[PDB]
């Protein structure tokens, strides 16, 4: 199992590039490639990738051709180029998982005993990362239903080598805004977090709408998880949590006040120095 | 539009549409682009567009072009030099000449080129008494031409500057508006 | 602000200039020349700068 996975800007760029290549060549709506990386302790760093010729139908959910001969040729060649980048999984640029994903994961597992799929949604997004990482795992159902292979999510994030960071920063030299300030950036992070929480709640609400109306069968694991969450929701009017909140709010506002006073004194010192310099310069000019 | 060349086309289109009008909206757009836009070529084009828009009132250009010339971007400085040249062409503006004089001998080949060319455009058909810098700039041009220190583009600027100064047998001036006050479309297009 | 930024950008350029040696003057000649022992080896006669 892999709890954490780090994808790289080179991987993202190559995935976008492969999607564009296939779009220009024909019309598939999805592209699949192989993903090479390292195995830092319980952390999968996927450093590179290469496209492989993949095709599938839209109806049977079983008619799909993946060229593992091309896969192994390209992998051995990339091994000749660089050795540390071993097969670590595969990627497919679908907006969402597919039925074939389990079979393709088995085909990859024929190569990597612990293969991690990463859906790299090439379509631009706003409230989430572009990579969704999954790992196949057997689901031993408690209700006696037969055990079946299923995809399990693993926390995925984007990280860069030193050179990758240098390159991406050069590319974003004029777009990325760095004159924001730490406080402004953190407030932006807070509002983005609120937006993400709202998006997750809206997804759950839509699923509940579908289930209640009847499109989706009752999923007992999901219902268990939902009621566990709703029970985990805290109470902020207990008359003891309120006292603790006020006590810590004051314990923080005292420090904020001290810092503000110190900043005010420093600003007054700067003003005194500036006015002293101004008078000295003016008097010397008048001399 | 995405293309930097299309953005430069937009700057030049603003220049041509509002030439001479001195429209504050066009000035705002051009100057904001010259400031904040991510391509140096289009920044320079925007400054030149501002120069085009401000030629009916050559007294106003010196301020903005000075702020943009004692400035950051080499392309912005060069655009300011050409804006001054286009604005004051045929006027012999002392303020514009004073602004361009520091720009000559700038640490950039094309900036020096533009400053020299604009200076010659301004002193087109001028003499010592009208503006007491013509001899200074002529000797500067001659030294730049018969020097090896200066870069090839500075040499190009100096040759063009001498040509402008002595243009038309020294019997011609460059005026974007006719002597009767009508914008001279051939002159605008030529510049 | 613009002067500050320009100073930085010219700083990157003018920090690649060769560093200047340090030498102890032992005796000043005529015609604007000075005998200097340059650390740690070498005794030259160097023309003084016109400043």
């Amino acid at each position: 199992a892999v709890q954490k996975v780090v994808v790289h800007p080179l991987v993202l760029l190559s995935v976008v590039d492969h999607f564009n290549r296939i779009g220009k060549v024909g019309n598939q709506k999805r592209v699949v490639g192989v993903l090479l990386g390292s195995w830092q302790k319980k952390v999968l760093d996927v450093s590179n990738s290469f496209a492989v010729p993949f095709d599938e139908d839209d109806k049977d959910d079983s008619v799909w051709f993946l060229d593992h001969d091309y896969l192994e040729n390209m992998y051995g060649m990339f091994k000749k180029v660089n050795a540390r980048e071993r097969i670590v999984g595969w990627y497919h640029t679908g907006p969402k998982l597919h039925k074939n994903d389990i079979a393709i994961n088995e085909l990859m597992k024929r190569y990597c005993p612990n293969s991690v799929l990463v859906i790299i949604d090439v379509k631009p997004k706003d409230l989430g990362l572009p990579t969704e990482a999954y790992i196949s795992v057997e689901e031993v159902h408690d209700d006696g239903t037969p055990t079946s292979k299923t995809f399990e999510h693993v926390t995925s994030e984007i990280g860069a080598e030193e050179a990758e960071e240098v390159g991406v920063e050069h590319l974003l030299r004029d777009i990325k805004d760095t004159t924001v300030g730490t406080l402004s950036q953190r407030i932006t992070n807070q509002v983005h977090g609120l937006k993400g929480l709202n998006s997750k709640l809206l997804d759950i609400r839509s699923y509940l709408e579908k289930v209640a109306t009847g499109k989706l069968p009752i999923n007992h694991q999901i219902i268990y998880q939902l009621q566990d969450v709703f029970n985990l929701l805290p109470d902020v009017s207990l008359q003891e949590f309120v006292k603790a909140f006020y006590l810590k709010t004051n314990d923080q506002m005292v420090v904020v006040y001290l810092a503000s006073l110190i900043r005010s004194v420093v600003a007054l010192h700067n003003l005194i120095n500036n006015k002293i310099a101004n008078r000295d310069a003016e008097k010397k000019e008048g001399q | 539009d995405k293309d930097p060349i299309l953005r430069r086309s937009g700057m030049y289109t603003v220049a041509m549409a509002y030439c001479g009008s001195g429209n504050n909206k066009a000035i705002r757009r051009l100057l904001h682009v010259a400031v904040s836009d991510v391509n140096d070529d289009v920044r320079r084009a925007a400054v030149e567009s501002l120069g085009f828009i401000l030629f009916r009132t050559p007294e106003q250009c010196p301020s903005v072009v000075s702020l943009l010339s004692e400035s950051y971007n080499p392309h912005v400085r060069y655009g300011a030099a050409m804006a001054l040249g286009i604005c004051c062409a045929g006027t012999g503006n002392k303020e514009a000449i004073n602004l361009l004089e520091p720009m000559t001998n700038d640490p950039v080949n094309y900036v020096r080129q533009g400053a020299l060319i604009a200076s010659a455009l301004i002193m087109i058909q001028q003499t010592e008494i009208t503006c007491p810098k013509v001899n200074q700039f002529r000797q500067l041009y001659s030294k730049v031409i018969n020097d090896k220190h200066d870069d090839v583009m500075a040499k190009f600027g100096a040759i063009l500057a001498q040509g402008i100064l002595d243009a038309g047998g020294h019997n011609v001036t460059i005026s974007l508006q006719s002597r009767t006050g009508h914008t001279h479309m051939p002159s605008v297009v030529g510049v | 602000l613009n002067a500050k930024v320009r100073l930085l950008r010219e700083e990157l350029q003018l920090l690649q200039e060769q560093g200047s040696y340090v030498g102890e003057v032992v005796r000043a000649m005529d015609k604007k020349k000075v005998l200097v022992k340059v650390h740690p080896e070498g005794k030259f006669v160097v023309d003084v700068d016109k400043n």
Binding site: S260, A267, L268, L271, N278 | - | -
Partner: peptide, 30 residues
Amino acid sequence: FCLDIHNMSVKAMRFPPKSAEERREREQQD
């Protein structure tokens, strides 16, 4: 009030109004 004091001081600070031979020398020495 402290933040107001800092802002007022920063606003109040008055900034008073304010070589090519080296350029050539560098180019020649290089």
